[PDB]
């Protein structure tokens, strides 16, 4: 990348800035609200019609 | 509660006035008292020294931007190297600056240093107690490096704030100063070494060695007080001396303006870094300055238009950053060349240009280590109490036209004083007090017309 | 394989520690070894002056851009001026410079000049081989002006490459020089002439033409040396300064600094020229970086689009580089105070001020022409062997406590030679070289405790 930079094959010597690392990613952590919940309960009691 | 403000005139004060003389004698104004003063000086050496990551800087890394980014490559790198120069132009002033400041020999340090002084710049065997004064006041961030980024990570302090861990999301990078300050604080503890001796000659490769007083006394002679005065004195003077020296314990205050030019100093720095900061949440009127908000609200035919906006807004902000860096470093050189000049006058020797050093002729000068620079301070004398006396412009036998005398460093006056039978009588330059006027104390010239004729008693030449 | 990098502390070299001693004598610090030796410095005085066409650099002929550009021809007018102000400054610049260094009177020059000193800055009547040494190792393109056009032009090599051939396709107007590179050598050579001497009270009216050693020892002499020693080491003084002069040789390479700056003065030069032409194949989002394409390309209604675009971008650089170059000019013309300002003191004159030259204390300092400036090669004077002595702040006659005298430029050691039968001996304050105390070397002083009680004998006073 260095050689790049100067479009030489033949760079000065220094200490020289490089690009740094872009860490690394872990899995997914998302919070949403939850209980929906389908009033299906009716059918449990009393006699079916 | 307060008041109506009040207008008022700006007042002048007027010089003392002195009136002229319209014959062979004239007015002469002398001080008859003098204190010790300081005045104090920061001069900037360094600018912080930072890189910029010219990809982190612009995106995150997602790779809609790495494919468009490959058409502005070449800018990027006209940003690092621009900076990579300015970054190594500071480093050159640096080194520069201290080949002249080190000595090639000096006087070991020692506590209880120049004896009846109080000398509270000796350092805690160190820097010294003054500089730590001066950094504690200072409301500069905590430095990283070691330990550095694990005080920026998870395992830390929810309320640190510091640009310094910005900087491993900014891509910033700040780059740690050329010199570790135990090596800059050898190079002035050279410099308080080096005092004595500053007379005898130019003191170019000689070195007096001789106690710090005893170089006081000396320049002392050097401004015109003759050593009469000096002798009967010497406490009283040690005194004076201390006394200015202990008002710089409460120097520290923003009233002082040398102290506020540090702290502007400082916060030229920080200033710099945070605009950048800022602009990363500066959208163009792009969707969003989020790259991941702008690739999860759009078809990627549209994505990537409001993508290159924010781009072009990204590197012209960067663009215009190194420009604003490369005034201020060349800034910078220019001041840490006025530096150097000073460290081999004002510090490492008497000087008699005025201007330069505190406004009260020289004596001896002092610099200590301060953020981005040095912080000098002066040593000055200030007259008081001046007083008219009748003075001549020389004295000559008048039997013998041919023998004329003037005095040296001082002048004749009419004497004033019951322990001299003399009708005439010395005094230095800098301080009243009579003397007799012998040969020390003169020189022979060719004859005047503005000369006294002496009919009775002259001792230098007897005849 | 070469090894891995080792990871290393950085050295600093500690003073030579000087023990403070208590009472009426103290240790001083001497030289018994010296050697010549030189530094450069590069000054740069100029920038280089250049012109544009905005009729040219914009569009080329084309008449549909020509009338575009009409509306726009005010922001030309403001470009031209502010070049053309820019050329105006640097020729004074140039003026100013000149007054300083020409002199009323000098010495003619011939060669074999200055004895048994080498002095290879003679000129080989010319300029001299030192500046053409420079030159060689410059790596700049070939000049301008003559034949100028015609290596632009097929007849010629193919293997040019001369941007000066690009000065014709992108508008590029190089004015020449005003000093004229033989009157530049006139100059230089008048400087020459003013050596032997500076010494002998002001130096500015009178001319001293004395031989060149003799103005080196009197300017050694200046620093301290005894007479008696430059005496007897007359020709080790030659043969000491020859050895300094042959390292010039050496002296060009891409470690000396000063070397290296000259070069960096003209890669800037050219980087800004190399600026607008890359410029000229930018697109702006244009379909073509050619006028003449777009046009015929494209209907007159939707053309004219792309011009627009285009055009405004070439406006935009031009601006940019205009005010580049008023920075640069501006620096350029600060820098030349600053040579003149050495020329009318470290060449001129012997100074005492330690700081401006090289760091040997100062002894004759010389300037020879270099691209767009001035470089500086300092003689200086390097104190090595150091040895301690004891040594009295100074003497008085025990039987009379008013005869009191002190050193002159020197100072009273113990005798450790055993020519001397006399307890006490004056020394040269840059050099070990104890000799008799003289009336010559002394001088009386005020009594002061610190004075040795001398019961024998003393020959100043005799009595
Ligand atoms: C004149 O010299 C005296 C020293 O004798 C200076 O000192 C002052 O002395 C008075 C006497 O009581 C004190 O009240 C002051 O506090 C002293 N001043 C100090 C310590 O700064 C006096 O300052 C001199 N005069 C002037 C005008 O400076
Ligand atoms: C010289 O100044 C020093 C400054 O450090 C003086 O030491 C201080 O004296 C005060 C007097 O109350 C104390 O409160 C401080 O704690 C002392 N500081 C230190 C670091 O010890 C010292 O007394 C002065 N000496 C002379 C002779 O003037
Ligand atoms: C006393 O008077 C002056 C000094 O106060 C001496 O100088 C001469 O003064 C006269 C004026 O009357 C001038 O014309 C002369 O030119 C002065 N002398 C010189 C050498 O310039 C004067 O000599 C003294 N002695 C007398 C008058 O005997
Ligand atoms: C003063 O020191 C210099 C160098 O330190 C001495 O020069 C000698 O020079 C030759 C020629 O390059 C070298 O080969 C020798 O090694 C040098 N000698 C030493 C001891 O370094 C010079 O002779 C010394 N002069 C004295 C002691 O009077
Ligand atoms: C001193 O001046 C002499 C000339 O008087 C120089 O000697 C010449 O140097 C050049 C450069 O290499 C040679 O081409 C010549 O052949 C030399 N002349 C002779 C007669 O041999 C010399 O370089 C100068 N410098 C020193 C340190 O002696
Ligand atoms: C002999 O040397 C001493 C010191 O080495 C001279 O200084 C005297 O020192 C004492 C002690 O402080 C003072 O009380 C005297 O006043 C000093 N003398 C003077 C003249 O100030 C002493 O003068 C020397 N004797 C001579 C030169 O005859
Ligand atoms: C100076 O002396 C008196 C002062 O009152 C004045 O009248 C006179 O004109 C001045 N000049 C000369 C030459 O005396
Ligand atoms: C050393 O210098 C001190 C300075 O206060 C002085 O008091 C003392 O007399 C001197 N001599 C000795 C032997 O301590």
Known sequence: ????????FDVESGVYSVSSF??????????????????????????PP | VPGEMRLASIAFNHPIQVDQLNSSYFKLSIPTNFSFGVTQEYIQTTIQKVTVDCKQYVCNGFQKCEQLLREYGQFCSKINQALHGANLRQDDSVRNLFASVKSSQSSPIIPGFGGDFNLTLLEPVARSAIEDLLFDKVTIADPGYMQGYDDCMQQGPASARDLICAQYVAGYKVLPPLMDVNMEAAYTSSLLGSIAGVGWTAGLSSFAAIPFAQSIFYRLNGVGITQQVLSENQKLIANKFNQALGAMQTGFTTTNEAFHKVQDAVNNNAQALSKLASELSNTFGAISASIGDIIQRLDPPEQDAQIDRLINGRLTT?????????????????SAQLAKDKVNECVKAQSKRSGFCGQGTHIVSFVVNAPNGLYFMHVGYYPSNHIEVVS????????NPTNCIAPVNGYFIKTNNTRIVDEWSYTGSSFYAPEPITSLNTKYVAPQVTYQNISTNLPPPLL
């Open chain 1, 1 to 8: 990348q260095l050689h790049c930079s100067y479009e030489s």
């Open chain 1, 22 to 47: 872009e860490a690394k990613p872990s899995g997914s952590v998302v919070e949403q609200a939850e209980g929906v919940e389908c009033d299906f309960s009716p059918l449990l009691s009393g006699t």
């Open chain 2, 318 to 334: 960067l663009n215009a950053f190194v420009a604003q860096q490369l005034v201020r470093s060349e800034s910078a050189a220019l």
């Open chain 2, 392 to 399: 001549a412009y020389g004295l000559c036998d008048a039997a």
